[PDB]
Design a protein around this ligand. Structure first.
Ligand SMILES: Nc1nc2c(ncn2[C@@H]2O[C@H](COP(=O)(O)OP(=O)(O)OP(=O)(O)O)[C@@H](O)[C@H]2O)c(=O)[nH]1
Ligand SMILES: Nc1ncnc2c1ncn2[C@@H]1O[C@H](COP(=O)(O)OP(=O)(O)CP(=O)(O)O)[C@@H](O)[C@H]1O
Ligand SMILES: Nc1nc2c(ncn2[C@@H]2O[C@H](COP(=O)(O)OP(=O)(O)O)[C@@H](O)[C@H]2O)c(=O)[nH]1
Ligand SMILES: [Ca+2]
Ligand SMILES: [Ca+2]
Ligand SMILES: [Ca+2]
Ligand SMILES: [Ca+2]
Ligand SMILES: [Mg+2]
Ligand SMILES: [Mg+2]
Ligand SMILES: [Mg+2]
Lengths: 438, 54, 349, 425
């Protein structure tokens, strides 16, 4: 058994972390007080769920998680929430004032003053791991903390934990729910600085989640709570292999090995189905073929783009619920004859499939209906480069006038880091072109 | 289209389906950059305070 | 009201569409780089499809289908026809063609050529590439070696295609021609064939002897308007419209344009566009597409119709700009952005 | 995240007093500092503007400054006069005679250390000081000259804190003295350098609104100040109640100010009131963008919006809010610069202001504000080319060169705006 430490940075990272651990407790049968009746080894053990939960002699199951925000209002929710009893003070880290949506303020000005405290709290969790796998890092692209402090943390983690793997869950900025106008700056700066320190990053575009919530959950004006409970479902299906018995993606390394043949191109596209409104009492239950087919609908992707006009490097199907291999292969055979699914010439045209018999868990009283089977597809397609191109274009429009740049320089950042970061994204865009275009 | 590496456990199973075959900065360097940015902030504040003293 | 941007100032068709839209009082034009548009009249090259459909609250429509180049590039069309099961290894309406680079068919081509030589059948082929415009870069040869030599002397991928040695010749004049059909595909992937086509005719008589003279063989409007005398003696601008051509087919061949030719044209349009529909449909996309296509057809002396190429950014006949451009507004634009009989034939599928 | 409020001079104290009356009403605070509200949202961010004293009393974090006692005696006698901390009244006796030099260099110089003592005392009581807001006019002597002196001294002691002002611009239509253009031009230079955000409240616009829209034949400063307190409540709503957007002063400045000098905002409000009919979301959106609803006498159709913040208050369809905001951008698609993507941000607060079931406040960073500075610059030059009324200032130790420099800097500011009004992508 090898442990995984989750790190949640900034408002988005913290609030999504809160939703994920709520869902983990529902999935593993852990009550809000940390007790787990089904766990017969009191105060210890090396079960699959122990990869995410440690144990006290009193029988409490404690998340292997650290929460970090530069202002205390979001993390205080954790402290006074339903699952407050789960964590202890050492795991919650709040500062006095935030990065004001300013990458440079989160990375340089405030990051320098808090990084050693964060590492020390991380070191304490690591010291309880007999075989630490690595870290899962949740954060937004657009916030000053999520962008600026994360990138500093990732650099220091590569130093303090050279051999360990690091995975990201990153919230890509969407104007429909976005606060700041400088988020394209923060996104590019943090991607540039974090690129060589991340083994595999799952981008979630708030635009896509927002649209899924409006279209499938019939929520007129989705809130962060709506968005985060849907995101937590996707995160859960992605980390389930680390927390349950299985043979696919049982180690953080397996994510890189199965999804990332080229280190820089480490942003798999996630697609999830089915998303069904809980307000609908009766809903026709979708088959293996139908939910699998839905993995090739852009409307169900975590980032809106057209995989028909890209190339696949790797493709994983993660099913939860009443699924058997026979149905998966029958569905795949049909979908291949009907869909545009072109792999790069130097990769096998195939799918790694994992099935977990326990159906998805849904928060009681939430917006998602209980389904008998669901699937999350992780596909590394060049089509996700469309999301880099959009971001890079917004960056270019503002930077050509140096709009807002004085805010970053005023925190000690040099103007050259902008163009340096932008040139990195240009190379990234060219890497995707060279891999997926004829 | 063949299936391979079928692993079964009580909680589920996993396998692979093949349709067609194919054809870091140091700690000192980080502290350097952080202190460089802090010094640039200090220089700019010193200019402000000098301007205000004038 | 509705908003649109113009990013191909060189489009005769959409310059008129834009002009029509403004004259409606319900459309406003914005600067080329304003993202808050409802309609993009995009550029022919590098159209930024990946930036469409991400403006909150805007239904966005573009006048090109991403991926339609597969049909409108000479090399890609050959590859698409030979590999698409829907079009099969062999479909009877496209001339035997091969892609030759200076995934290469330089060998299978010579095989069929040698076979024809041994059969002493018509063994005339025409090499061409979508890199040459204005009749530049074509070579009609009876000898295969002359064809390949001409290819290697260039740097563009080329296709070699059997030359229709027995074309249908209009009379008087013993004159070759081709048919241009305009097809509009809307955001729902309805296929609308404009009721008015045009024949682009050769002014000089067809000479099956020497192919050196690239005039009586190439029916392109520019080659006739500059390289051939008597340009315009038979009809204005070497362009015959369907009423006259239909009347001719009746008088000369006791048949109609619909029966002898248009059935095959409609079949070929359907087959091509239905083939690529899974790959380019915007039915479940965050933005929608329509596109106007120019299909080019040959007719042989047996009244069999052959597809020659598909143009993705076609121009229009001067007499037909108004009607067709108005049709674009009604069928493709106003259908998505409503205001306050039919010139198209809907090809059901 | 505490804000420290400062009000200086006659205008600054009369407008500031009304501001505290209005928001004290919204947060449920009575004239004696006792809370008698009915919703927890009133108190969640009460600390931003109020200190808590024993007995669960709430004391405005407000400092009242003037060089004569008259107006501050009125405040202390006014409706909520007893709610202010008595130590926070700091005043002289000489007055400043509508003279920027007296406020900034002579009379004001003598009093400023006492003001900074009180400011330091409020700051020291803040768990995490967010910054300062100053209410003042630019046309007089104390608010203009001493107000900008205070901002400079505050910037010196608290260089890393945000400085925001509500600055009342003079107009010949609502004028006390001919020297107002001198005082305002001298002050604008200070503001260009030493504030992060300045709400430009134009007494010309306020008069026009009272006259043309509110149908007040003879507007008084009381009538104009009703518009200002309503506007100040609107623009501080996102600071005073739970919210995601422009939550604190620094995040707001980051989203509103693309270039450091261009931080002068045109505020707007709807509905304009001085009526029982419900106002629909479309009406709110159309009005708040209408030039007639702007508090600075500038036509937004004459320039372009760099950034816009819009705050909707009341219970309303947030879907309709997004729908109308996205709509109006298309009706004015050309008046938003295209090189700042998504530069219009919208916030909603369920608490409506007193007497309205819903309302909308508009905050625009528009290049059209250059019209306001051009107006001031012309009035300044008409007198300065003849050195008229200068002796009032040279008599206080000032030299003509200082006027020449202030005028140059404001013309630079105008040409800065014009530069970005012509800029395209
Ligand atoms: N999906 C989702 N997105 C969020 C959430 N909270 C914030 N965001 C998004 O994150 C971006 C803003 O970054 P934040 O995480 O709020 O900022 P921060 O990391 O706390 O850093 P600061 O600037 O110091 O506040 C915007 O694009 C928001 O839409 C959340 O709970 N769920
Ligand atoms: N296989 C063939 N057999 C007989 N004639 C042919 C032929 N291929 C081409 N032609 C003749 O050559 C002319 C030009 O060929 P092609 O269509 O490749 O050029 P092009 O791409 O310029 C057409 P357009 O002017 O519409 O763009 C055609 O109009 C036709 O008359
Ligand atoms: N809106 C408004 N403007 C005022 C008020 N009092 C004065 N003014 C304006 O402020 C300027 C006069 O400055 P004032 O504040 O009275 O002088 P000070 O005491 O030295 O700061 C002129 O432009 C007046 O029109 C007021 O109560 N409301
Ligand atoms: Ca145990
Ligand atoms: Ca590493
Ligand atoms: Ca004295
Ligand atoms: Ca002192
Ligand atoms: Mg935050
Ligand atoms: Mg062509
Ligand atoms: Mg006065």
């Amino acid at each position: 058994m090898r442990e995984c430490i989750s790190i949640h940075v900034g408002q988005a990272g913290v609030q999504i972390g809160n939703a994920c651990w709520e869902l983990y407790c529902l999935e593993h049968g852990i009550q809000p007080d940390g007790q787990m009746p089904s766990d017969k080894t009191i105060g210890g053990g090396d079960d699959s769920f122990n990869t995410f939960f440690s144990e006290t002699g009193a029988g409490k199951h404690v998340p292997r998680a650290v929460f970090v925000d530069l202002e205390p209002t979001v993390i205080d929710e954790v402290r006074t929430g339903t699952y407050r009893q789960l964590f202890h003070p050492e795991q919650l880290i709040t500062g006095k004032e935030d990065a004001a949506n300013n990458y440079a303020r989160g990375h340089y000005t405030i990051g320098k003053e808090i990084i050693d405290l964060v590492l020390d709290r991380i070191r304490k969790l690591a010291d309880q791991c007999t075989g630490l796998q690595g870290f899962l890092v949740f954060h937004s692209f657009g916030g000053g903390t999520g962008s600026g402090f994360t990138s500093l943390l990732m650099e220091r983690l590569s130093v303090d934990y050279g051999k360990k793997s690091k995975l990201e869950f990153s919230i890509y900025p969407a104007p429909q729910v976005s606060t700041a106008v400088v988020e394209p700056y923060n996104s590019i700066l943090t991607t540039h600085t974090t690129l060589e320190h991340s083994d595999c990053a799952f981008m979630v575009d708030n635009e896509a989640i927002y649209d899924i919530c409006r279209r499938n959950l019939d929520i007129e004006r989705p809130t962060y709570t709506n968005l985060n409970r849907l995101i937590s479902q996707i995160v859960s299906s992605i980390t389930a292999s680390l927390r349950f018995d299985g043979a696919l993606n049982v180690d953080l390394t397996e994510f890189q090995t199965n999804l990332v043949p080229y280190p820089r191109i480490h942003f798999p596209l996630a697609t999830y189905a089915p998303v069904i409104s809980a307000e609908k009492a009766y809903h026709e239950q979708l088959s293996v073929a139908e939910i699998t087919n839905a993995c090739f609908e852009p409307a169900n992707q975590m980032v809106k783009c057209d995989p028909r006009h890209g190339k696949y490097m790797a493709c994983c199907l993660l099913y939860r619920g009443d699924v058997v291999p026979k149905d998966v292969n029958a569905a795949i055979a049909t979908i291949k004859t009907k869909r545009s699914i072109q792999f790069v010439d130097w990769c096998p045209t195939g799918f790694k499939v994992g099935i977990n018999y326990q159906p998805p868990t849904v928060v009681p009283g939430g917006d998602l209906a209980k389904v008998q089977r669901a699937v999350c597809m992780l596909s590394n397609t060049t089509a996700i480069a469309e999301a880099w191109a959009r971001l890079d274009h917004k960056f270019d429009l503002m930077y050509a006038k140096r709009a807002f740049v004085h805010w970053y320089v005023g925190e000690g950042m040099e103007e050259g880091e902008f163009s340096e970061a932008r040139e990195d994204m240009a190379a990234l865009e060219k890497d995707y072109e060279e891999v997926g275009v004829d | 289209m063949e299936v391979i590496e079928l692993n079964k456990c009580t909680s589920g199973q996993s396998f692979e389906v093949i349709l067609k075959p194919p054809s870091d900065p140091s700690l000192e360097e980080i502290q350097k950059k952080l202190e460089a940015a802090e010094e640039r902030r200090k220089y700019q504040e010193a200019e402000l305070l000098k301007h205000l003293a004038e | 009201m509705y908003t649109f941007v113009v990013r191909d100032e060189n489009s005769s068709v959409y310059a008129e569409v834009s002009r029509l839209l403004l004259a409606t009082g319900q459309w406003k034009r914005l600067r080329k780089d304003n993202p808050r548009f409802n309609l993009m009249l995009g550029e022919r090259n590098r159209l930024p499809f990946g930036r469409l459909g991400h403006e909150p609250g805007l239904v966005q429509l573009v006048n090109y289908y991403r991926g339609a180049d597969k049909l409108c590039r000479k090399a890609s069309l050959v590859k698409l026809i030979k590999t698409s099961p829907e079009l099969s290894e062999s479909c009877t309406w496209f001339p035997e063609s091969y892609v030759i680079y200076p995934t290469d068919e330089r060998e299978v081509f010579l095989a069929a050529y040698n076979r024809r030589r041994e059969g002493r059948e018509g063994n005339v082929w025409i090499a061409k590439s979508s890199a040459g415009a204005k009749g530049e870069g074509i070579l009609i040869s009876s000898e295969a070696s002359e064809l390949l030599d001409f290819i290697d002397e260039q740097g563009q991928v080329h296709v070699i295609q059997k030359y229709l040695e027995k074309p249908l010749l209009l009379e008087p004049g013993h004159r070759k021609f081709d048919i241009r059909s305009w097809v509009l595909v809307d955001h729902l992937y309805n296929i609308y064939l404009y009721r008015e086509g045009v024949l682009r005719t050769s002014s000089e008589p067809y000479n099956s002897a020497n192919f050196q003279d690239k005039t009586c063989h190439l029916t392109n409007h520019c080659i006739q308007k500059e390289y051939s005398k008597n340009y315009g003696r038979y009809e204005e601008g070497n362009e015959m419209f369907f009423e006259e051509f239909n009347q001719y087919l009746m008088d000369a061949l006791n048949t109609t344009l619909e029966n002898s030719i248009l059935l095959q044209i409609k079949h070929i349009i359907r087959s091509c566009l239905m083939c690529i529909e899974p790959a380019i449909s915007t039915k479940h996309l965050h933005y929608q597409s329509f596109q106007l296509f120019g299909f080019d057809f040959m007719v042989d002396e047996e009244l069999k119709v052959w597809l020659i190429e598909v143009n993705g950014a076609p121009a229009c006949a001067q007499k037909l700009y108004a009607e067709l451009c108005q049709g674009i507004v009604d069928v493709a634009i106003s259908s998505v952005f409503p205001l306050a009989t039919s010139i198209f034939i809907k090809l059901h599928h | 995240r505490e804000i420290v409020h400062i009000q200086a001079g006659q205008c600054g104290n009369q407008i500031g007093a009304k501001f505290w009356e209005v928001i004290s009403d919204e947060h449920g605070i009575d004239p004696t500092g006792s809370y008698h509200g009915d919703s927890d949202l009133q108190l969640e961010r009460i600390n931003v503007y109020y200190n808590e004293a024993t007995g669960n009393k709430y004391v405005p974090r407000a400092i009242l400054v003037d060089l004569e006692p008259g107006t501050m005696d009125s405040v202390r006698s006014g409706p909520f006069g007893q709610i202010f901390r008595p130590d926070n009244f700091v005043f002289g006796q000489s007055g400043a005679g509508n003279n920027w030099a007296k406020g900034h260099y002579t009379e004001g110089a003598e009093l400023v250390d006492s003001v900074l003592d009180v400011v330091r005392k409020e700051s020291e009581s803040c768990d995490c000081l967010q910054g300062f807001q100053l209410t003042h006019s630019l046309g007089g002597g104390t608010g203009s000259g001493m107000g900008t002196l205070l901002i400079s001294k505050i910037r010196e002691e608290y260089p890393d804190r945000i400085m925001n002002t509500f600055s009342v611009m003079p107009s010949p239509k609502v004028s006390d003295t001919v020297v107002e253009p001198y005082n305002a031009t001298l002050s604008v230079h200070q503001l260009v350098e030493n504030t992060d955000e300045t709400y430009c409240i134009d007494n010309e616009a306020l008069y026009d609104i009272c006259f043309r829209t509110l149908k007040l034949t003879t507007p008084t400063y009381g009538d104009l100040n009703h518009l200002v307190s309503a506007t100040m409540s609107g623009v501080t709503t996102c600071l005073r109640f739970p919210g995601q957007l422009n939550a604190d002063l620094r995040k707001l400045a980051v989203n509103m100010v693309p270039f450091p000098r261009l931080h002068f905002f045109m505020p707007g409000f709807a509905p304009l009131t001085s009526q029982y009919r419900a106002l629909t979301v479309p009406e709110l959106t159309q009005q708040m963008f209408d030039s007639k609803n702007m508090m600075a006498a500038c036509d937004p159709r004459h320039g372009r919006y760099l950034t816009v913040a819009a705050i909707f208050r009341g219970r309303m369809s947030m879907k309709e809010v997004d729908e109308q905001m996205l709509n109006v951008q298309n009706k004015n698609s050309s008046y938003f610069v295209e090189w700042i993507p998504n530069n219009v941000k919208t916030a909603v607060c369920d608490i409506p202001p007193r007497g309205l079931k819903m309302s909308a406040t508009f905050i625009g960073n528009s290049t059209a504000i250059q019209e306001l500075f051009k107006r001031i610059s012309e009035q300044f030059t008409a007198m300065f080319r003849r050195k008229a009324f200068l002796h009032w200032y040279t008599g206080e130790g000032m030299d003509e060169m200082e006027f020449t420099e202030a005028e140059s800097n404001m013309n630079d500011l105008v040409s800065e705006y014009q530069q970005y009004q012509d800029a395209t992508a």
